Amino acid sequence: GSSGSSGMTVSGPGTPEPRPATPGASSVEQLRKEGNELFKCGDYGGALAAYTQALGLDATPQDQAVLHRNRAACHLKLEDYDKAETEASKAIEKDGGDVKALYRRSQALEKLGRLDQAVLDLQRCVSLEPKNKVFQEALRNISGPSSG
């Protein structure tokens, strides 16, 4: 047995939307907060759980991505680089300009043994944010000395 999905044949930037203010509402729009809230506290095991539910709902295509890149963050902390890497990609394919998943993806790769790649992803982070130095450095951090 197996499952899947294909399409992404839609084009559009997106649009914001309001949200209710009350506990219990397990709506990706609201519940989502639960994830970050747990992250800013350190609780990784939980933070992820929240992000999971959110993705397991009828959320917008612009929000589904933000969650993907978020899932990785949790993994990385939970010695889940292997997965973290993949997750990131899912958030990169959705849009493409998500440097967030990129900066995180590299971190995972470096552990997997794929350096060259870690650099490629970063190189992109510099484009999106021509000011964010964190990238200009993170690159040389894994690029190390030149050989050959």
PDB file of C-alpha atoms in Angstrom:
ATOM      1  CA  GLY A   1       0.000   0.000   0.000  1.00  0.00           C
ATOM      2  CA  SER A   2       1.000   3.610  -0.614  1.00  0.00           C
ATOM      3  CA  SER A   3      -0.293   7.157  -1.086  1.00  0.00           C
ATOM      4  CA  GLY A   4       0.643  10.479  -2.654  1.00  0.00           C
ATOM      5  CA  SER A   5      -0.494  13.584  -4.519  1.00  0.00           C
ATOM      6  CA  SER A   6       0.334  15.666  -7.594  1.00  0.00           C
ATOM      7  CA  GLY A   7      -0.772  19.011  -8.994  1.00  0.00           C
ATOM      8  CA  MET A   8       0.682  22.327  -7.852  1.00  0.00           C
ATOM      9  CA  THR A   9      -0.725  23.665 -11.124  1.00  0.00           C
ATOM     10  CA  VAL A  10      -1.867  26.883  -9.447  1.00  0.00           C
ATOM     11  CA  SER A  11      -0.309  30.338  -9.764  1.00  0.00           C
ATOM     12  CA  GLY A  12      -0.613  33.187  -7.282  1.00  0.00           C
ATOM     13  CA  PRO A  13       1.210  35.180  -4.581  1.00  0.00           C
ATOM     14  CA  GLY A  14      -1.363  34.631  -1.851  1.00  0.00           C
ATOM     15  CA  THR A  15      -3.247  36.682   0.729  1.00  0.00           C
ATOM     16  CA  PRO A  16      -3.529  37.110   4.521  1.00  0.00           C
ATOM     17  CA  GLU A  17      -6.557  36.208   6.638  1.00  0.00           C
ATOM     18  CA  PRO A  18      -8.004  36.884  10.116  1.00  0.00           C
ATOM     19  CA  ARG A  19      -8.097  34.347  12.949  1.00  0.00           C
ATOM     20  CA  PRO A  20     -10.278  33.719  16.031  1.00  0.00           C
ATOM     21  CA  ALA A  21      -9.042  34.243  19.590  1.00  0.00           C
ATOM     22  CA  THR A  22      -9.952  31.230  21.726  1.00  0.00           C
ATOM     23  CA  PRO A  23      -8.382  28.001  23.050  1.00  0.00           C
ATOM     24  CA  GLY A  24      -9.323  24.574  21.731  1.00  0.00           C
ATOM     25  CA  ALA A  25      -9.607  25.710  18.119  1.00  0.00           C
ATOM     26  CA  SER A  26      -7.334  23.088  16.562  1.00  0.00           C
ATOM     27  CA  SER A  27      -7.141  25.087  13.332  1.00  0.00           C
ATOM     28  CA  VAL A  28      -3.793  25.163  11.526  1.00  0.00           C
ATOM     29  CA  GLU A  29      -4.284  28.934  11.466  1.00  0.00           C
ATOM     30  CA  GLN A  30      -4.459  29.099  15.262  1.00  0.00           C
ATOM     31  CA  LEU A  31      -3.059  25.820  16.588  1.00  0.00           C
ATOM     32  CA  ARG A  32       0.007  26.644  14.494  1.00  0.00           C
ATOM     33  CA  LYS A  33       1.015  29.086  17.232  1.00  0.00           C
ATOM     34  CA  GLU A  34       1.258  26.144  19.632  1.00  0.00           C
ATOM     35  CA  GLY A  35       4.280  24.982  17.657  1.00  0.00           C
ATOM     36  CA  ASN A  36       6.291  28.201  17.763  1.00  0.00           C
ATOM     37  CA  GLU A  37       5.165  28.853  21.337  1.00  0.00           C
ATOM     38  CA  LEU A  38       6.711  25.522  22.328  1.00  0.00           C
ATOM     39  CA  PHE A  39       9.840  26.263  20.296  1.00  0.00           C
ATOM     40  CA  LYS A  40      10.526  29.630  21.929  1.00  0.00           C
ATOM     41  CA  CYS A  41      10.406  27.649  25.174  1.00  0.00           C
ATOM     42  CA  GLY A  42      12.641  24.782  24.093  1.00  0.00           C
ATOM     43  CA  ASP A  43      10.005  22.052  24.010  1.00  0.00           C
ATOM     44  CA  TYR A  44      10.945  20.476  20.679  1.00  0.00           C
ATOM     45  CA  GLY A  45       9.003  17.248  21.104  1.00  0.00           C
ATOM     46  CA  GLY A  46       5.820  19.281  21.337  1.00  0.00           C
ATOM     47  CA  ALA A  47       6.543  22.121  18.924  1.00  0.00           C
ATOM     48  CA  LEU A  48       6.696  19.534  16.140  1.00  0.00           C
ATOM     49  CA  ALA A  49       3.452  17.835  17.166  1.00  0.00           C
ATOM     50  CA  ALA A  50       1.614  21.130  16.692  1.00  0.00           C
ATOM     51  CA  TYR A  51       3.122  21.756  13.257  1.00  0.00           C
ATOM     52  CA  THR A  52       2.031  18.235  12.320  1.00  0.00           C
ATOM     53  CA  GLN A  53      -1.677  18.786  12.964  1.00  0.00           C
ATOM     54  CA  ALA A  54      -1.610  22.132  11.158  1.00  0.00           C
ATOM     55  CA  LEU A  55      -0.241  20.410   8.056  1.00  0.00           C
ATOM     56  CA  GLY A  56      -2.827  17.669   8.480  1.00  0.00           C
ATOM     57  CA  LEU A  57      -5.609  20.130   7.690  1.00  0.00           C
ATOM     58  CA  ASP A  58      -7.074  22.143   4.815  1.00  0.00           C
ATOM     59  CA  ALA A  59      -4.642  25.042   5.203  1.00  0.00           C
ATOM     60  CA  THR A  60      -3.554  27.455   2.472  1.00  0.00           C
ATOM     61  CA  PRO A  61      -0.649  26.655   0.114  1.00  0.00           C
ATOM     62  CA  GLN A  62       1.264  29.628   1.515  1.00  0.00           C
ATOM     63  CA  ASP A  63       0.966  28.366   5.092  1.00  0.00           C
ATOM     64  CA  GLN A  64       1.690  24.711   4.328  1.00  0.00           C
ATOM     65  CA  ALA A  65       5.211  25.730   3.318  1.00  0.00           C
ATOM     66  CA  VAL A  66       5.952  27.742   6.459  1.00  0.00           C
ATOM     67  CA  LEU A  67       5.106  24.583   8.403  1.00  0.00           C
ATOM     68  CA  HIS A  68       7.400  22.362   6.335  1.00  0.00           C
ATOM     69  CA  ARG A  69      10.440  24.551   7.000  1.00  0.00           C
ATOM     70  CA  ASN A  70       9.385  24.611  10.656  1.00  0.00           C
ATOM     71  CA  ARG A  71       9.263  20.826  11.015  1.00  0.00           C
ATOM     72  CA  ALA A  72      12.949  20.639  10.094  1.00  0.00           C
ATOM     73  CA  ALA A  73      13.955  23.042  12.865  1.00  0.00           C
ATOM     74  CA  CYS A  74      12.471  20.662  15.434  1.00  0.00           C
ATOM     75  CA  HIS A  75      14.170  17.629  13.888  1.00  0.00           C
ATOM     76  CA  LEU A  76      17.618  19.229  13.754  1.00  0.00           C
ATOM     77  CA  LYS A  77      17.368  19.782  17.510  1.00  0.00           C
ATOM     78  CA  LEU A  78      16.129  16.210  17.942  1.00  0.00           C
ATOM     79  CA  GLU A  79      19.119  14.688  16.151  1.00  0.00           C
ATOM     80  CA  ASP A  80      16.873  14.334  13.102  1.00  0.00           C
ATOM     81  CA  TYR A  81      19.126  15.885  10.459  1.00  0.00           C
ATOM     82  CA  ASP A  82      18.383  13.104   7.974  1.00  0.00           C
ATOM     83  CA  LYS A  83      14.709  14.088   7.934  1.00  0.00           C
ATOM     84  CA  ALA A  84      15.224  17.787   8.654  1.00  0.00           C
ATOM     85  CA  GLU A  85      16.983  18.055   5.292  1.00  0.00           C
ATOM     86  CA  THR A  86      14.058  16.549   3.382  1.00  0.00           C
ATOM     87  CA  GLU A  87      11.437  18.611   5.210  1.00  0.00           C
ATOM     88  CA  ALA A  88      13.276  21.801   4.255  1.00  0.00           C
ATOM     89  CA  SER A  89      13.098  20.895   0.566  1.00  0.00           C
ATOM     90  CA  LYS A  90       9.327  20.510   0.871  1.00  0.00           C
ATOM     91  CA  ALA A  91       9.225  24.126   2.049  1.00  0.00           C
ATOM     92  CA  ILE A  92      11.579  25.202  -0.737  1.00  0.00           C
ATOM     93  CA  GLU A  93       9.605  23.595  -3.563  1.00  0.00           C
ATOM     94  CA  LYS A  94       6.334  25.171  -2.430  1.00  0.00           C
ATOM     95  CA  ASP A  95       7.640  28.681  -3.099  1.00  0.00           C
ATOM     96  CA  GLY A  96      11.386  28.753  -3.679  1.00  0.00           C
ATOM     97  CA  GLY A  97      12.437  31.950  -1.948  1.00  0.00           C
ATOM     98  CA  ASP A  98      12.265  30.309   1.471  1.00  0.00           C
ATOM     99  CA  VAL A  99      15.833  30.894   2.653  1.00  0.00           C
ATOM    100  CA  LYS A 100      14.645  29.699   6.062  1.00  0.00           C
ATOM    101  CA  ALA A 101      14.587  26.028   5.070  1.00  0.00           C
ATOM    102  CA  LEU A 102      17.828  26.619   3.166  1.00  0.00           C
ATOM    103  CA  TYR A 103      19.815  27.839   6.170  1.00  0.00           C
ATOM    104  CA  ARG A 104      18.465  24.844   8.084  1.00  0.00           C
ATOM    105  CA  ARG A 105      18.904  22.301   5.290  1.00  0.00           C
ATOM    106  CA  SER A 106      22.642  22.974   5.059  1.00  0.00           C
ATOM    107  CA  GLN A 107      23.048  22.357   8.789  1.00  0.00           C
ATOM    108  CA  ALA A 108      21.604  18.875   8.283  1.00  0.00           C
ATOM    109  CA  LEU A 109      23.635  18.067   5.169  1.00  0.00           C
ATOM    110  CA  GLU A 110      26.906  19.022   6.859  1.00  0.00           C
ATOM    111  CA  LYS A 111      26.125  16.164   9.245  1.00  0.00           C
ATOM    112  CA  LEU A 112      25.068  13.743   6.507  1.00  0.00           C
ATOM    113  CA  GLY A 113      28.446  14.342   4.890  1.00  0.00           C
ATOM    114  CA  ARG A 114      27.209  16.389   1.942  1.00  0.00           C
ATOM    115  CA  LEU A 115      29.219  19.611   2.172  1.00  0.00           C
ATOM    116  CA  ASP A 116      29.188  20.770  -1.450  1.00  0.00           C
ATOM    117  CA  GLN A 117      25.392  20.801  -1.198  1.00  0.00           C
ATOM    118  CA  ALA A 118      25.318  22.654   2.122  1.00  0.00           C
ATOM    119  CA  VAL A 119      27.158  25.443   0.305  1.00  0.00           C
ATOM    120  CA  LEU A 120      24.801  25.515  -2.679  1.00  0.00           C
ATOM    121  CA  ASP A 121      21.747  26.065  -0.480  1.00  0.00           C
ATOM    122  CA  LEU A 122      23.506  28.807   1.484  1.00  0.00           C
ATOM    123  CA  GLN A 123      24.658  30.590  -1.673  1.00  0.00           C
ATOM    124  CA  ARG A 124      20.943  31.159  -2.253  1.00  0.00           C
ATOM    125  CA  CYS A 125      20.360  32.582   1.227  1.00  0.00           C
ATOM    126  CA  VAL A 126      22.725  35.406   0.280  1.00  0.00           C
ATOM    127  CA  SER A 127      20.614  36.313  -2.751  1.00  0.00           C
ATOM    128  CA  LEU A 128      17.287  36.643  -0.939  1.00  0.00           C
ATOM    129  CA  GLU A 129      18.867  38.521   1.966  1.00  0.00           C
ATOM    130  CA  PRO A 130      21.800  40.560   0.595  1.00  0.00           C
ATOM    131  CA  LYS A 131      22.142  42.046   4.079  1.00  0.00           C
ATOM    132  CA  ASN A 132      21.897  38.992   6.334  1.00  0.00           C
ATOM    133  CA  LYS A 133      25.575  38.333   7.052  1.00  0.00           C
ATOM    134  CA  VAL A 134      24.750  35.152   8.968  1.00  0.00           C
ATOM    135  CA  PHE A 135      24.875  33.586   5.505  1.00  0.00           C
ATOM    136  CA  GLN A 136      28.004  35.282   4.166  1.00  0.00           C
ATOM    137  CA  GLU A 137      29.706  33.533   7.084  1.00  0.00           C
ATOM    138  CA  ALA A 138      27.809  30.249   7.361  1.00  0.00           C
ATOM    139  CA  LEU A 139      29.216  29.618   3.885  1.00  0.00           C
ATOM    140  CA  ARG A 140      32.916  29.921   4.713  1.00  0.00           C
ATOM    141  CA  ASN A 141      32.091  28.016   7.901  1.00  0.00           C
ATOM    142  CA  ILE A 142      31.428  24.855   5.894  1.00  0.00           C
ATOM    143  CA  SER A 143      33.461  25.757   2.809  1.00  0.00           C
ATOM    144  CA  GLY A 144      36.660  25.717   4.844  1.00  0.00           C
ATOM    145  CA  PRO A 145      40.014  25.882   3.024  1.00  0.00           C
ATOM    146  CA  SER A 146      40.437  25.288  -0.708  1.00  0.00           C
ATOM    147  CA  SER A 147      42.085  22.115  -2.009  1.00  0.00           C
ATOM    148  CA  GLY A 148      42.797  20.474  -5.351  1.00  0.00           C
TER     149      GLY A 148
END
